[PDB]
Amino acid sequence: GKGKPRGLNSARKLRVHRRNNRWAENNYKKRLLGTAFKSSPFGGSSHAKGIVLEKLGIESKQPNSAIRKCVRVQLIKNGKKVTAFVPNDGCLNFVDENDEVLLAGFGRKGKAKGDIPGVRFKVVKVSGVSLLALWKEKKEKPRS
Amino acid sequence: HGSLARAGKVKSQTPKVEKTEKPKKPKGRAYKRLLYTRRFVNVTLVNGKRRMNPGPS
Amino acid sequence: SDAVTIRTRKVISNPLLARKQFVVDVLHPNRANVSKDELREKLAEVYKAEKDAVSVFGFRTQFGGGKSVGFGLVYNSVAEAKKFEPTYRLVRYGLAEKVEKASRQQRKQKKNRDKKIFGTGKRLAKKVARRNAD
Amino acid sequence: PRAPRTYSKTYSTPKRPYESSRLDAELKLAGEFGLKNKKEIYRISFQLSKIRRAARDLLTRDEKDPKRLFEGNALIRRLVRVGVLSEDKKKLDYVLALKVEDFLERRLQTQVYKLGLAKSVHHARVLITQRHIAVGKQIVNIPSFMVRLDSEKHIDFAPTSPFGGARPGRVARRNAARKAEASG
RNA sequence: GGAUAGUGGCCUACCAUGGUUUCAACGGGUAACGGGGAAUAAGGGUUCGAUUCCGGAGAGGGAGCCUGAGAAACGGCUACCACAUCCAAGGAAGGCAGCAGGCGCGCAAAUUACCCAAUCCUAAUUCAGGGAGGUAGUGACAAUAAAUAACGAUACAGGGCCCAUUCGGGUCUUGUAAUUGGAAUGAGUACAAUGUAAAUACCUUAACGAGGAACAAUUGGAGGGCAAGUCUGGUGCCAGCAGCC
Incomplete structure (x- = not known):
């Protein structure tokens, strides 16, 4: 029995059955459809420039209690509105508004990382000035 | 509770202490030599389970 | 120096270019390096032909010193060397004069100039005179 | 247009990183054989892994198989040429059995220490990298050598x-100038 | 039958109504040039392959054509379309997806350099030309090797062995050190030769070039997976950490 045929001339049946089950698989689907290119904000790119517009004070999911100090961003090549977790302490004050920041993902491939709901992306630079560098004063942001 | 302020709180409020001076440590193969002569011929901490960073006990 | 002992290796006569060619090693301890003119006079007296006739090129020093290895090449005479060898080899030996030229970009610029000009130029000169008269 | 230069590494990182036994073993090896780099250790392990895959997929084959004969004899020939293998153990199971310790003791630095020109493997290291050594009649400044035993017969200090001899030293002449000024 | 260099609906005249299809035709999509191959593996395999090599296509999009053995040529013409320039406003000249270089696009990518010295190609031809190509500059894309420190003696603490003459020597140890001393070359300066078309680098060696304040190795992390603090201060579900818990 077992389901799956066994004849020596049924490889067509096997491939097409497998094709349907690969459509049921996860990464085959979004890869062959180009969700990353047609619906995702980045366009399947590792990073992306962006312009912050305003600030947001998303509270943390349970079981936890904080406010995560994220921001609202628009891209340039696309023009889509994105939220982004300003990672470290004081960095929001570093990245107040109008800044041509750089964004990337979290490390979970299109999902939110921790107790930070609605956010998949974060900031890594400010007009070519790194946020860890700003945080540790190894470099400093052009004021104007 | 309106906490969309206070960013940088503890990093500003922290009492600034600075790194004391000490000699430059061995580098490379010298470091691996230090690790060997600390871990094996120095029998300094083998009590039951070989700690490496003994807190003051 | 102290016992250069310039020694040739894999010698072979090529009568077609009318020369003889080999790969040569010098052993210099207590010694920075040999010089090309020194090597050429040494090979000229060991192979009896002439200083401007014998030639050399290469001579990489083996690591740590103590020896170098290069290519030495004697010709049947000075005239044979002068007719067969490249101008760069003759001028670095000092046997000839390296004709001076400008930048390749400047040669190409003047080439484009006389390519945009057609004919000798005397007629165009007289015409430009008669035109720039007023 | 220029046909591209082949490049390929000579090491491979561990599959699973943090195993205290593995870490302590390779630390043992580095601190006894005078090494700087787990990179180097992985390199030696990679050579051993290469020969071990070769040994396995050759001894899998029957006897008097000319492939087995040719490849096993060439492996034997280079292993005896380097001395990692002996001159009387050619049965291929010792090749299955051989050690990173064997490769390391056939290296140059600890060889220098056994020959006694060092007083410590780290002293051997600094002599190698400061070029106070030569295995033939040409100086070498690389620890990782895989000696061919003619070097072993021919060890001496650096002639230059x-x-x-042949020079007292840079700082020797420095001290001599110091003492000349002091006497003056 | 015309045309072709040639077969042939390639095209025309007349005639027959056929040809492909669930063994996925035809239409749509493709961040699709194909391949030699690349990453990755016990086996089976999955993913990628613009990109140095082979065969194709194109020169801003299309169409046409002269010369020629060979082009549907674009560093050759003709027109149109969209671009764009010089005008003493009548007119004229162009196609960097060639090498450099610039704007814009962006996460994302080098000098408006030197040489035909080689490797080859072209011509009537050894001799000339070649951003094909080679050299150097930028360059932490990736790969190889490999500095940042070592060594003797002086103050502690050991292990075999001799005396077993007590806990005295410890001959020799191997580390701990606000101990001290030497020698030891490298990075960088090199006089120079060598290097190369000319060089600049590599290798060579003069002369000058360390005692740590010297010539100063960072990047991650310490509750588990996952190796590494029940240390100190600050903070007090706030700020923040964390790929998962």
Whole structure:
């Protein structure tokens, strides 16, 4: 029995059955459809420039209690509105508004990382000035 | 509770202490030599389970 | 120096270019390096032909010193060397004069100039005179 | 247009990183054989892994198989040429059995220490990298050597450095100038 | 039958109504040039392959054509379309997806350099030309090797062995050190030769070039997976950490 045929001339049946089950698989689907290119904000790119517009004070999911100090961003090549977790302490004050920041993902491939709901992306630079560098004063942001 | 302020709180409020001076440590193969002569011929901490960073006990 | 002992290796006569060619090693301890003119006079007296006739090129020093290895090449005479060898080899030996030229970009610029000009130029000169008269 | 230069590494990182036994073993090896780099250790392990895959997929084959004969004899020939293998153990199971310790003791630095020109493997290291050594009649400044035993017969200090003469030293002449001024 | 260099609906005249299809035709999509191959593996395999090599296509999009053995040529013409320039406003000249270089696009990518010295190609031809190509500059894309420190003696603490003459020597140890001393070359300066078309680098060696304040190795992390603090201060579900818990 077992389901799956066994004849020596049924490889067509096997491939097409497998094709349907690969459509049921996860990464085959979004890869062959180009969700990353047609619906995702980045366009399947590792990073992306962006312009912050305003600030947001998303509270943390349970079981936890904080406010995560994220921001609202628009891209340039696309023009889509994105939220982004300003990672470290004081960095929001570093990245107040109008800044041509750089964004990337979290490390979970299109999902939110921790107790930070609605956010998949974060900031890594400010007009070519790194946020860890700003945080540790190894470099400093052009004021104007 | 309106906490969309206070960013940088503890990093500003922290009492600034600075790194004391000490000699430059061995580098490379010298470091691996230090690790060997600390871990094996120095029998300094083998009590039951070989700690490496003994807190003051 | 102290016992250069310039020694040739894999010698072979090529009568077609009318020369003889080999790969040569010098052993210099207590010694920075040999010089090309020194090597050429040494090979000229060991192979009896002439200083401007014998030639050399290469001579990489083996690591740590103590020896170098290069290519030495004697010709049947000075005239044979002068007719067969490249101008760069003759001028670095000092046997000839390296004709001076400008930048390749400047040669190409003047080439484009006389390519945009057609004919000798005397007629165009007289015409430009008669035109720039007023 | 220029046909591209082949490049390929000579090491491979561990599959699973943090195993205290593995870490302590390779630390043992580095601190006894005078090494700087787990990179180097992985490199030696990679050579051993290469020969071990070769040994396995050759001894899998029957006897008097000319492939087995040719490849096993060439492996034997280079292993005897380097001395990692003996001159009387050619049965291929010792090749299955051989050690990173065997490769390391056939290296140059600890060889120098056994020959006694060092007083410590780290002293051997600094002599190698400061070029106070030569295995033939040409100086070498690389620890990782895989000696061919003619070097072993031919070890001496650097001729173009003291302990084999021909110069007293840079800082030797420096001290001599110091004492000349002091006497003056 | 015309045309072709040639077969042939390649095209025309007349005639027959056929040809492909669930063994996925035809239409749509493709961040699709194909391949030699690349990453990755016990086996089976999955993913990628613009990109140095082979065969194709194109020169801003299309169409046409002269010369020629060979082009549907674009560093050759003709027109149109969209671009764009010089005008003493009548007119004229162009196609960097060639090498450099610039704007814009962006996460994302080098000098408006030197040489035909080689490797080859072209011509009537050894001799000339060649951003094909080679050299150097930028360059932490990736790969190889490999500095940042070592060594003797002086103050502690050991292990075999001799005396077993007590806990005295410890001959020799191997580390701990606000101990001290030497020698030891490298990075960088090199006089120079060598290097190369000319060089600049590599290798060579003069002369000058360390005692740590010297010539100063960072990047991650310490509750588990996952190796590494029940240390100190600050903070007090706030700020923040964390790929998962």
